[PDB]
Amino acid sequence: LRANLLVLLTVVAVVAGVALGLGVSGAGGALALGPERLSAFVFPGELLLRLLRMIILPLVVCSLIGGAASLDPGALGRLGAWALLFFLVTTLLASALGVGLALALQPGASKEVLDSFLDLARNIFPSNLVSAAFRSYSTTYEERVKVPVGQEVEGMNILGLVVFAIVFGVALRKLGPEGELLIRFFNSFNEATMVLVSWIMWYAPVGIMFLVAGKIVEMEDVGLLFARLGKYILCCLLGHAIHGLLVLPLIYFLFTRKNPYRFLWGIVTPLATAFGTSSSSATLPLMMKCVEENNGVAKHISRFILPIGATVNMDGAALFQCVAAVFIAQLSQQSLDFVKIITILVTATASSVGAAGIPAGGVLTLAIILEAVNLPVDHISLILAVDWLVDRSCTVLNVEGDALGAGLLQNYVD
Amino acid sequence: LRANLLVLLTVVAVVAGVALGLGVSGAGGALALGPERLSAFVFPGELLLRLLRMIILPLVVCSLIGGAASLDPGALGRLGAWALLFFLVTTLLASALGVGLALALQPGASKEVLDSFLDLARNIFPSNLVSAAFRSYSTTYEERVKVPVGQEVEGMNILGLVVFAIVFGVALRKLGPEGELLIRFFNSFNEATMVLVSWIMWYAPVGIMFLVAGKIVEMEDVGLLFARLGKYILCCLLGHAIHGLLVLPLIYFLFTRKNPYRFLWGIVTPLATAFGTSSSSATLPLMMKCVEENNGVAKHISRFILPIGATVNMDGAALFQCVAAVFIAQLSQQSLDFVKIITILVTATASSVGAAGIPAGGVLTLAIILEAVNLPVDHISLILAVDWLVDRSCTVLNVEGDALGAGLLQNYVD
Amino acid sequence: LRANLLVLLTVVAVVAGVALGLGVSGAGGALALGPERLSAFVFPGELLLRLLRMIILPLVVCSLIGGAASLDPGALGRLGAWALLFFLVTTLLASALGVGLALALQPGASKEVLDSFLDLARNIFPSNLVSAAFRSYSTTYEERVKVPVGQEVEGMNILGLVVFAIVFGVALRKLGPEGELLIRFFNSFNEATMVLVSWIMWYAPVGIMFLVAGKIVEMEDVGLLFARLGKYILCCLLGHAIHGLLVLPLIYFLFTRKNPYRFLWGIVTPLATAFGTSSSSATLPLMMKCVEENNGVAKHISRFILPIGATVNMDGAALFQCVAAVFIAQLSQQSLDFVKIITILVTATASSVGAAGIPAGGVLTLAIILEAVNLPVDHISLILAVDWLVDRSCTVLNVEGDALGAGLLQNYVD
Ligand SMILES: NC(=O)CC[C@H](N)C(=O)O
Ligand SMILES: NC(=O)CC[C@H](N)C(=O)O
Ligand SMILES: NC(=O)CC[C@H](N)C(=O)O
Ligand code: NA
Ligand code: NA
Ligand code: NA
Ligand code: NA
Ligand code: NA
Numbered sequence A, B, C: 001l002r003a004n005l006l007v008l009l010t011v012v013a014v015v016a017g018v019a020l021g022l023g024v025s026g027a028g029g030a031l032a033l034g035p036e037r038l039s040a041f042v043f044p045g046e047l048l049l050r051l052l053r054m055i056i057l058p059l060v061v062c063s064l065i066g067g068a069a070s071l072d073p074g075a076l077g078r079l080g081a082w083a084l085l086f087f088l089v090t091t092l093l094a095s096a097l098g099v100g101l102a103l104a105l106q107p108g109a110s111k112e113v114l115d116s117f118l119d120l121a122r123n124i125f126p127s128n129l130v131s132a133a134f135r136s137y138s139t140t141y142e143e144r145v146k147v148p149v150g151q152e153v154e155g156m157n158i159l160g161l162v163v164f165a166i167v168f169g170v171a172l173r174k175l176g177p178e179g180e181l182l183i184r185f186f187n188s189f190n191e192a193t194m195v196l197v198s199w200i201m202w203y204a205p206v207g208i209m210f211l212v213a214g215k216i217v218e219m220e221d222v223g224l225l226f227a228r229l230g231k232y233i234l235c236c237l238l239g240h241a242i243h244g245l246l247v248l249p250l251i252y253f254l255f256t257r258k259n260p261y262r263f264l265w266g267i268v269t270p271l272a273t274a275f276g277t278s279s280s281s282a283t284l285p286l287m288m289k290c291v292e293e294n295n296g297v298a299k300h301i302s303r304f305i306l307p308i309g310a311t312v313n314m315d316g317a318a319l320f321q322c323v324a325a326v327f328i329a330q331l332s333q334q335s336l337d338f339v340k341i342i343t344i345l346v347t348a349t350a351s352s353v354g355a356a357g358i359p360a361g362g363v364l365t366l367a368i369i370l371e372a373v374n375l376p377v378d379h380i381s382l383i384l385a386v387d388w389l390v391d392r393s394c395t396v397l398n399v400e401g402d403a404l405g406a407g408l409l410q411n412y413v414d
């Protein structure tokens, strides 16, 4: 079976890439390779990333337009309400789990908040669709007292495109016969993009191998990081594993009484792609393919939930942010009252939506939680030493939550 | 009736926003609110602006393609000739009225001209459509003697998109059966964008309220501006009122013997949206909706004239530019001969086309008239103190001229 | 016949533009005209360039999608293999001819190579289609040892768009009935863009006249250039003439036993447009029109080969690069062994693909050959004095090779 062959090839890609990176580092790593030969060594992973980012846009737009135009606006609204409830509850549970793990294990033994949320709202409503295709609104500060002035910076505004696609699909549904032509157009475009996804899946193993090989070759050494941040890394990774292997599967089983680990086997490939790429947006294409044809999720439910979740639902990001907040508080020996914990949870849950879903997109918002909850911000300099791995662990769970919620809402629809 | 309800809500939005801004300023204004809370206070207006600018592009492009493909190229050429004649004559009349008011009341008691027009011509023929969707060609100067070097700067090139849409629609018409598919596609897209416009119209009241509230909260105080520029403000606003309430309605009545104030009631909402947003491009979406369904203008005539006029026809801009030129000449006590007045009129009429139709887009060209007609340029520093209001007054009349010309050409077609 | 009238008008445009430029230079040139009047003088050529660049994008994309969707993937693969073989062989022959001419006549009596090829590969796989529509990936260097860091710089990524269009057309072919709607859509769009091309062809004469008039008016004087670079100019131009009038027609005749000069008469107009614009991308629109309706090349074969070749096949560029390499080696009296010559040929052939097909796009890569083959790079400062003409001579042959290969593959298909 080609699906099992692809899954095996992706697992072997991850393992052999770890092995190749370890062997290259033992042979000297970047210093032995040199900057030019190092850049040439990690290139296939960059090609995989580029290939995925090339199709993020048309796939997301067309799939969401078709999905929103495939349902009654009332039914679509109810489905979206349930999906948002599931996303929010899972993110809150991940935040609480992260805080609890950080408090129990005790691993620790900028932009304004208002400006961050206003930028979120601005990106939700893009001022230009073509610009939104490759730029997002971001606020910097001038001194005149700090005055916030904003501009469009590099980075696809996936959130604004998602919102516009949903709204445009609802409009097409409202049109009736006149909008059917555009529905057919976008469905055909999405099917072609899905064919491209199927072709890119076969290159995904090589890209993942080289991604992981380069990222572990880029390290100074395992000891230098772990001897100082081992308990923090353990907190983050263990929370991710508990949420993805126990909590989320538990919820799926209780609401969808089917074997969740079969569902996870059906998406092993996009999970490894998320680990390799460290971005939910780039692995979303593969996740949609697998969830549609490897599992029994309906086409419209998948194409409506997965793209929305990949931008709004981020359980790993919230867990990492809470663990980081508690770790920084413990480093400074700051007291954490119940109000303080609730504030951490709420701020992490709210910022997870604003996370751009791109590599190193959690540290940008971590300062927001460290500001809402007054804590030393400079200590983030430590987290960046291990963010290259915690971010991948976060992306894995982030896309896993999307897939499991899509399955759960498929069961609810059925 | 929902139309009358929306009109009443928009009028109440303008009035209550003025009241809210006055109350906030009396309570202290920005200093009492603070920069963060001020930014949060004016946000809904920015959201309305973003929502409108999001749909300017697809609406303009699809509507113009469909309109140009809906008529015989000869009939389309005759319609465009009549529309251009009407626009030019109305702009010349506005320029003459502004000059006459400035001379009678006597309120006054950079980029090269060639480079400005070459940039206009370049933007008319965009070098890239995707870039034109969010950028426009602009010329800066290097010293080597000043050499003009140009680049693409932020700002949608609505003029180039309009020209390309008209040309592409004519091409589709030339194709015949083969082009009908694209005509259907663009008509469906425009209808969906019009549904989005209908949804945005219901948020327009809140956005307008907050826009006006913030803009009058941003003031230092009414006295500081008026005690020095009251007669200039009076000249500009009175010329706008005379042109929009007497001259343009008079022309509409003589050429279209119907009550023009009923037509103006049919578009009160986009007029208030223009006042709030200070941009003809952003209020064009709402103007098209109203002119199509609130008045009896045909679909093709509206979708061909309104988008063209919103970029080419600007009577308020020309009136303001002439009043500013005469005001600056009177400040410096410069003599204005008949040749001088004719030059002012011609330059203002020509630059009105080049005006980008965006907030504060008239002061950019005012220097062009002050250069063609040698006058002190530095004095523009005064006008910027009141441009926030004169520009809104200009945009109101600018969109009003579009609507009335669309009605007049509808009568001519009938 | 309108075709012969257009050809005559374009030839007269070239000749009369040379005459006008010579007359203006004799009257003083830029100094007599002045910077403003000079900028106004050369404007029509810039308008022609903008008009062509406006349609490069939709034309290339839609034509390639339709062509790739019009053939069986196996047949399309065989056609592409033959086209690539022809392109590579012709480019190698041009490189060898340039090297031989430089060695016989002896006219001579930055970015890393790996980074250049990695940028080529990145542009082949664009990370964003909207960004690719007007930007291309380029690598600069930071000092930390030089570390290569890359970003998107201005310039349409025609190569990535070509690859994506071919892949998307193959995907549409794979879809079957569901993809036929998109095939029809893109065919209609390409036909409309071709109508626009037909309209732009009639303005092409004026633009070409003013282009050549300005470019020869921009000169200091013929003597200052020729008295020092005459034999190099002769080598380049004579190699181009030999390849375009003897070698390429010879190959066409042997593989397609028809009069090649009739085929060249059929494309005289795009050849002169290439000479005037100095860009294969901008003249590709006209070349497609002529090759389709002036000669007997099939629609799909043209729309598949011409856009691919205009980015991949550049015989003139390779010839110029080889002549420049040998000229610089002779200036420094560097020995050229057989290995050295083979390296020059291979590097020029490989870099010709990476050439962006835009004015002055050969000198960017010339340093790549001068680095792979260690030679003084500074001497390129001389070539820039004559690149304005050699680049045009290169573009002529570059598009001529595309047209002749399209005809040859048409014969092969027949
Ligand atoms: N730490 C995080 O989860 C940041 C976002 C993550 N890189 C993603 O794309 O899902
Ligand atoms: N003063 C003016 O009229 C400038 C243009 C105006 N802001 C508009 O968009 O119509
Ligand atoms: N010297 C060259 O051939 C560079 C590329 C050339 N300007 C073209 O577009 O074909
Ligand atoms: Na969640
Ligand atoms: Na997600
Ligand atoms: Na998010
Ligand atoms: Na007018
Ligand atoms: Na207007």
Ligand code: NA
Residues within 6 Å of the ligand: B310, B311, B312, B313, B314, B351, B352, B353, B354, B355, B356, B357
């Ligand atoms: Na204008």
Ligand code: NA
Residues within 6 Å of the ligand: C086, C087, C088, C089, C090, C091, C092, C313, C314, C315, C401
């Ligand atoms: Na070749």
Ligand code: NA
Residues within 6 Å of the ligand: C280, C309, C310, C311, C312, C313, C314, C398, C399, C401, C402
């Ligand atoms: Na070519």
Ligand code: NA
Residues within 6 Å of the ligand: C310, C311, C312, C313, C314, C351, C352, C353, C354, C355, C356, C357
């Ligand atoms: Na090339």
